[PDB]
């Protein structure tokens, strides 16, 4: 698998420019379970007005220039709340080498969380959020198929923002992520089986 990794982080709404709360658990056991990674911390405002567009820019930026400057550097992308978003919007920018070199893709709070794509999971891995629809859902693309299989969507129950049906907007449950174990376990078992194969 991967000897070298870039970890890219887009972080969500008013979080302080720095790691997202939402993937530090799991990061740090990815980064202990597969030697030669390291993080970028996607520079944008995650500004209240949610234009995510530099965000998006600076992941598909950040691909190409570590692809350019080494053609074995694989990624995982994490975005939580507007930064899934962003992240989302990236995903079709990044075709053949920078397709291939991205090897997993780990969404919470997704507001682009698509109906019943097998990438979606709810807080315990199950299904009670398979077939939400985001707060955005209803004007943006989320995941393209061709993504599917090295996506995980993680939306918790009562998330209003990747899960219309089960509360309004940014509800507690949105801001759990961080601090829940089995988010954590699953994301970090995704991350390391993506770049282990």
Same mark, same amino acid.
């Given at each position: 698998? #991967?000897?070298?990794?870039? /970890?890219?982080? *887009?972080?969500?709404?008013?979080?302080?420019?720095?790691?997202?709360?939402?993937?530090?658990?799991?990061?740090?056991?990815?980064?202990?379970? @597969?030697?030669?990674?390291?993080?970028?911390? *996607?520079?944008?405002?995650?500004?209240?007005?949610?234009?995510?567009?530099?965000?998006?820019?600076? /992941?598909?930026?950040?691909?190409?220039?570590?692809?350019?400057?080494?053609?074995?550097? #694989?990624?995982?992308?994490?975005?939580?709340?507007?930064?899934?978003?962003?992240?989302?919007?990236?995903?079709?920018?990044?075709?053949?080498?920078?397709?291939?070199? @991205? =090897?997993?893709?780990?969404? /919470?709070?997704?507001?682009?969380? =698509?109906?019943?794509?097998? #990438?979606?999971?709810?807080?315990?891995?199950?299904?009670?959020?398979?077939?939400?629809?985001? /707060?955005?859902?209803?004007?943006?693309?989320?995941?393209?198929?061709?993504?599917?299989?090295?996506?995980?969507?993680? #939306?918790?129950?009562?998330?209003?923002?990747?899960? @219309?049906?089960?509360?309004?907007?940014?509800?507690?449950?949105?801001?759990?992520?961080?601090?829940?174990?089995? @988010?954590?376990?699953?994301?970090?078992?995704?991350?390391?089986?993506?770049?282990?194969?």
């Amino acid at each position: 698998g #991967c000897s070298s990794y870039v /970890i890219i982080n *887009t972080r969500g709404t008013s979080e302080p420019q720095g790691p997202s709360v939402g993937f530090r658990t799991m990061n740090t056991r990815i980064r202990s379970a @597969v030697s030669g990674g390291s993080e970028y911390d *996607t520079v944008y405002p995650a500004g209240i007005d949610q234009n995510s567009a530099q965000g998006t820019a600076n /992941i598909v930026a950040q691909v190409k220039a570590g692809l350019a400057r080494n053609p074995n550097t #694989c990624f995982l992308l994490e975005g939580y709340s507007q930064g899934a978003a962003a992240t989302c919007n990236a995903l079709p920018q990044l075709t053949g080498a920078a397709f291939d070199a @991205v =090897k997993g893709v780990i969404l /919470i709070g997704n507001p682009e969380h =698509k109906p019943n794509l097998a #990438c979606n999971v709810d807080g315990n891995g199950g299904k009670t959020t398979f077939s939400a629809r985001g /707060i955005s859902a209803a004007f943006t693309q989320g995941v393209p198929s061709n993504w599917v299989s090295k996506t995980l969507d993680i #939306c918790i129950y009562g998330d209003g923002v990747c899960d @219309v049906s089960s509360g309004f907007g940014i509800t507690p449950q949105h801001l759990t992520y961080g601090y829940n174990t089995n @988010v954590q376990t699953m994301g970090a078992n995704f991350g390391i089986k993506a770049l282990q194969g």
